[PDB]
Amino acid sequence: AMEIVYDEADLRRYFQTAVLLDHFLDDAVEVDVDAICDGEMVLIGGIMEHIEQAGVHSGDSACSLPAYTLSQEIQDVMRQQVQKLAFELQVRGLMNVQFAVKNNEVYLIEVNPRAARTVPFVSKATGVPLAKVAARVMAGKSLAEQGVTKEVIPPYYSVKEVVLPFNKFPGVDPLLGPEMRSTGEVMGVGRTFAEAFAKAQLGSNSTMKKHGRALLSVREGDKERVVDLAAKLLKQGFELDATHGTAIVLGEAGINPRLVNKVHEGRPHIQDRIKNGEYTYIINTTSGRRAIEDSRVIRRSALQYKVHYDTTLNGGFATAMALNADATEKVISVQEMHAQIK
Amino acid sequence: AMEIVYDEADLRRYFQTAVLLDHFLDDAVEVDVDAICDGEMVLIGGIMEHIEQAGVHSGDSACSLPAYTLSQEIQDVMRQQVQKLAFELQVRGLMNVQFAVKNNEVYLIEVNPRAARTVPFVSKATGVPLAKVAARVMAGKSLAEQGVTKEVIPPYYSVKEVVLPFNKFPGVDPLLGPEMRSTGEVMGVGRTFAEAFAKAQLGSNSTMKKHGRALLSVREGDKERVVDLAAKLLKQGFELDATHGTAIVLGEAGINPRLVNKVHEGRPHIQDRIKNGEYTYIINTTSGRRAIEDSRVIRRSALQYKVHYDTTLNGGFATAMALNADATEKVISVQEMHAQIK
Numbered sequence: 225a226m227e228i229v230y231d232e233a234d235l236r237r238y239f240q241t242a243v244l245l246d247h248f249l250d251d252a253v254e255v256d257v258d259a260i261c262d263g264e265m266v267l268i269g270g271i272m273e274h275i276e277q278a279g280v281h282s283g284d285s286a287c288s289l290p291a292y293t294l295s296q297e298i299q300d301v302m303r304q305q306v307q308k309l310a311f312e313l314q315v316r317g318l319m320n321v322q323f324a325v326k327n328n329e330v331y332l333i334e335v336n337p338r339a340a341r342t343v344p345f346v347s348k349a350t351g352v353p354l355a356k357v358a359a360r361v362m363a364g365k366s367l368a369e370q371g372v373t374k375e376v377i378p379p380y381y382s383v384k385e386v387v388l389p390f391n392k393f394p395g396v397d398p399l400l401g402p403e404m405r406s407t408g409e410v411m412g413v414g415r416t417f418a419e420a421f422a423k424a425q426l427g428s429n430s431t432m433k434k435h436g437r438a439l440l441s442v443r444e445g446d447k448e449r450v451v452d453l454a455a456k457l458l459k460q461g462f463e464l465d466a467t468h469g470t471a472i473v474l475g476e477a478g479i480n481p482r483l484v485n486k487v488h489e490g491r492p493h494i495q496d497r498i499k500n501g502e503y504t505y506i507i508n509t510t511s512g513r514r515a516i517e518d519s520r521v522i523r524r525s526a527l528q529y530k531v532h533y534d535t536t537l538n539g540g541f542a543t544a545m546a547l548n549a550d551a552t553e554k555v556i557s558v559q560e561m562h563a564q565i566k
Numbered sequence: 567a568m569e570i571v572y573d574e575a576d577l578r579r580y581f582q583t584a585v586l587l588d589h590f591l592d593d594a595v596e597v598d599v600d601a602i603c604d605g606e607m608v609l610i611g612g613i614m615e616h617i618e619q620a621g622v623h624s625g626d627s628a629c630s631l632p633a634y635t636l637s638q639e640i641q642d643v644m645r646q647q648v649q650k651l652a653f654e655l656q657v658r659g660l661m662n663v664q665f666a667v668k669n670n671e672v673y674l675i676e677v678n679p680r681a682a683r684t685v686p687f688v689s690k691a692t693g694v695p696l697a698k699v700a701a702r703v704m705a706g707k708s709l710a711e712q713g714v715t716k717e718v719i720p721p722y723y724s725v726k727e728v729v730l731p732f733n734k735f736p737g738v739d740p741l742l743g744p745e746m747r748s749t750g751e752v753m754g755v756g757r758t759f760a761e762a763f764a765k766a767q768l769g770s771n772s773t774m775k776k777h778g779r780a781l782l783s784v785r786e787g788d789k790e791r792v793v794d795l796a797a798k799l800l801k802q803g804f805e806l807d808a809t810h811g812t813a814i815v816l817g818e819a820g821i822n823p824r825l826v827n828k829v830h831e832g833r834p835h836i837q838d839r840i841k842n843g844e845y846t847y848i849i850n851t852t853s854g855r856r857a858i859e860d861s862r863v864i865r866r867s868a869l870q871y872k873v874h875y876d877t878t879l880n881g882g883f884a885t886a887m888a889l890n891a892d893a894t895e896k897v898i899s900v901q902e903m904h905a906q907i908k
């Protein structure tokens with residue numbers, strides 16, 4: 225059990241119901257790196273960039289290989305960083321390192337000196353059977369001896385998306401957090417990140433549509449960025465709805481959504497609309513044990529009514545991007561994929 | 567002093583701060599009628615339809631001669647009612663009667679057996695010097711004897727608008743009510759009601775513009791009709807702004823105004839927007855002691871910053887209409903006006 229606390233008040237509050245204390249890196253990109261070390265050298269297996277920010281368990285985040293927003297310069301550091309750790313730790317076989325990029329700064333989140341649940345994905349995107357190689361390494365067959373020394377950079381985009389069990393347990397708030405709840409994953413392969421994401425999304429059993437009405441209800445820290453997402457949705461032909469606070473923000477930017485009522489506000493309220501199959505998309509971000517408990521109804525309703533909803537703005541942008549793509553336009557086989565690797 | 571209470575809880579409330587008790591005829595048209603009685607006949611001097619509904623002092627309402635919404639059917643009833651009263655009370659010279667029209671029903675508000683303040687306006691509008699006629703009657707000369715027996719209905723519209731002294735007392739909430747506060751009045755002469763109104767409004771020192779951003783903030787009972795007003799402003803080239811409840815109603819109408827924060831809501835709020843010159847027009851209607859007190863800021867700011875504002879929906883519609891006119895287009899003299907009368 226983990227939780228994020230925001231203020232002194234919040235602290236106590238936890239303490240009641242409720243030990244390491246760690247500063248939470250707000251508005252940070254989460255990254256996964258799987259690598260192999262034989263003592264001599266380090267082979268970077270894969271650099272995965274999470275769609276959802278740090279604070280949403282790696283295990284529940286979608287991720288891209290290669291990174292789709294991060295700088296080469298920045299990867300390069302993580303890369304250097306891993307190597308440093310691999311030797312220091314005296315890693316012999318697989319390892320996994322988790323970072324967080326904040327303001328062009330790399331923070332270390334944790335190191336797993338073992339095989340991580342990402343390996344099969346990486347193995348598949350890159351064509352390198354990371355598990356076998358690392359096994360060989362463990363048995364006494366260097367990377368050099370194996371002929372696997374260069375880091376592989378795929379020609380295409382591989383996106384990993386998760387599948388959550390919320391629908392089996394309705395009483396639960398289908399919301400993301402620092403604790404992993406997903407049961408499985410899918411993979412999307414595309415020429416563009418948008419394509420890959422689009423395939424991954426569909427694969428995960430998404431009910432996202434390419435038209436209709438979107439509901440925008442984001443948190444403070446998101447009010448600023450939501451503008452561009454709304455514009456993307458609008459460009460896509462979506463019609464918009466927004467809860468007061470968010471409507472305020474959009475409007476000041478030149479975007480007037482239809483104002484919708486919260487539950488305690490009037491009628492109809494979002495629930496009604498959700499229930500009536502009024503929306504095809506919901507973007508809902510929150511921040512705070514209270515704000516969360518208060519918005520629970522949006523999420524439960526959406527899940528219950530099969531409306532695709534995102535609980536992260538990052539996730540929403542990705543959803544938006546994927547709108548430009550067509551998951552059924554092109555298929556490729558694993559063999560072909562790997563045949564493409566130089 | 568007069569007040570309008572809305573519920574039992576309101577009654578006590580008043581009672582505390584605080585007797586005739588009169589049912590208040592909501593959503594009613596107020597009308598003024600000026601006439602002369604010589605004991606033999608009754609001469610109708612003028613039937614004036616107010617713009618502001620009953621509840622807004624006749625002395626502070628703009629009015630039209632002739633009526634601009636009242637059925638002939640209904641005016642005739644009032645004419646008959648004025649004759650009945652003239653004779654009964656034994657009027658000898660001028661009189662004035664105030665009615666309220668609710669649901670095609672004529673209600674009597676009051677009778678003033680003397681010369682009323684509308685007398686000069688009616689004389690100007692009609693070319694008949696009612697004070698001179700009534701004076702001769704008082705002195706012995708009948709209406710028949712003077713050759714003034716038929717009611718005059720002029721070929722043009724005459725609109726009277728008032729000027730309020732609120733600008734001299736900034737602490738005062740510049741809102742209309744059952745008690746008179748105006749100091750003066752002007753008259754507008756037009757081929758249409760919109761033209762007369764335009765001239766009257768301009769004559770009243772109104773800062774109304776034919777373009778810009780308007781702010782809508784209306785009460786419950788007006789939410790229905792506000793849509794049509796919002797559209798009308800739309801047709802004109804105005805951009806809209808609105809507070810929560812209003813925005814809600816407009817949204818349901820397909821009109822998406824730019825949301826605006828009530829003062830307790832956040833920012834920016836109306837005050838800021840008004841203070842920063844955002845608006846060129848304001849329509850703000852309120853009902854209830856409490857609601858009024860709360861909205862005080864809007865009105866006080868609108869006045870301080872010189873934005874044209876209406877405190878009645880009837881007023882806003884009139885304003886709406888006038889936009890279709892040009893008060894400088896044509897001018898006519900009283901001599902000319904009077905020669906047009908048959």
Ligand SMILES: Nc1ncnc2c1ncn2[C@@H]1O[C@H](COP(=O)(O)OP(=O)(O)O)[C@@H](O)[C@H]1O
Binds near residue numbers: 250279334403
């Ligand atoms: N300091 C931190 N700031 C922001 N997010 C963090 C921080 N520490 C952990 N997280 C988030 O919590 C998740 C779980 O943290 P982690 O230490 O890796 O736990 P686990 O052992 O369950 O894998 C991460 O994948 C990340 O999204």
Ligand SMILES: Nc1ncnc2c1ncn2[C@@H]1O[C@H](COP(=O)(O)OP(=O)(O)O)[C@@H](O)[C@H]1O
Binds near residue numbers: 622623624666675744
């Ligand atoms: N019962 C009522 N329903 C609606 N409006 C009314 C009612 N009684 C009076 N009014 C409003 O109050 C105003 C003033 O009332 P009135 O009886 O004419 O007093 P005054 O002596 O000031 O002329 C009217 O012009 C009208 O707007």
Ligand SMILES: NCCC[C@H](N)C(=O)O
Binds near residue numbers: 536
């Ligand atoms: N990557 C986890 C799934 C994301 C889900 N649509 C959500 O935004 O909550």
Ligand SMILES: NCCC[C@H](N)C(=O)O
Binds near residue numbers: 727875876
């Ligand atoms: N005839 C009354 C003046 C109108 C003013 N603009 C108001 O509506 O309050």
Ligand SMILES: [Cl-]
Binds near residue numbers: 392393394395396
């Ligand atoms: Cl359950």
Ligand SMILES: [Cl-]
Binds near residue numbers: 432433
């Ligand atoms: Cl679709």
Ligand SMILES: [Cl-]
Binds near residue numbers: 443444445446510511
């Ligand atoms: Cl926030």
Ligand SMILES: [Cl-]
Binds near residue numbers: 734735736737738
């Ligand atoms: Cl004052």
Ligand SMILES: [Cl-]
Binds near residue numbers: 774775776777
């Ligand atoms: Cl203008």
Ligand SMILES: [Cl-]
Binds near residue numbers: 786
């Ligand atoms: Cl009301």
Ligand SMILES: [K+]
Binds near residue numbers: 275277280282285
């Ligand atoms: K994450």
Ligand SMILES: [K+]
Binds near residue numbers: 334336
């Ligand atoms: K761990």
Ligand SMILES: [K+]
Binds near residue numbers: 617
């Ligand atoms: K009136």
Ligand SMILES: [K+]
Binds near residue numbers: 676678
């Ligand atoms: K009176």
Ligand SMILES: [Mn+2]
Binds near residue numbers: 282322334
């Ligand atoms: Mn972890």
Ligand SMILES: [Mn+2]
Binds near residue numbers: 664676
């Ligand atoms: Mn009166």
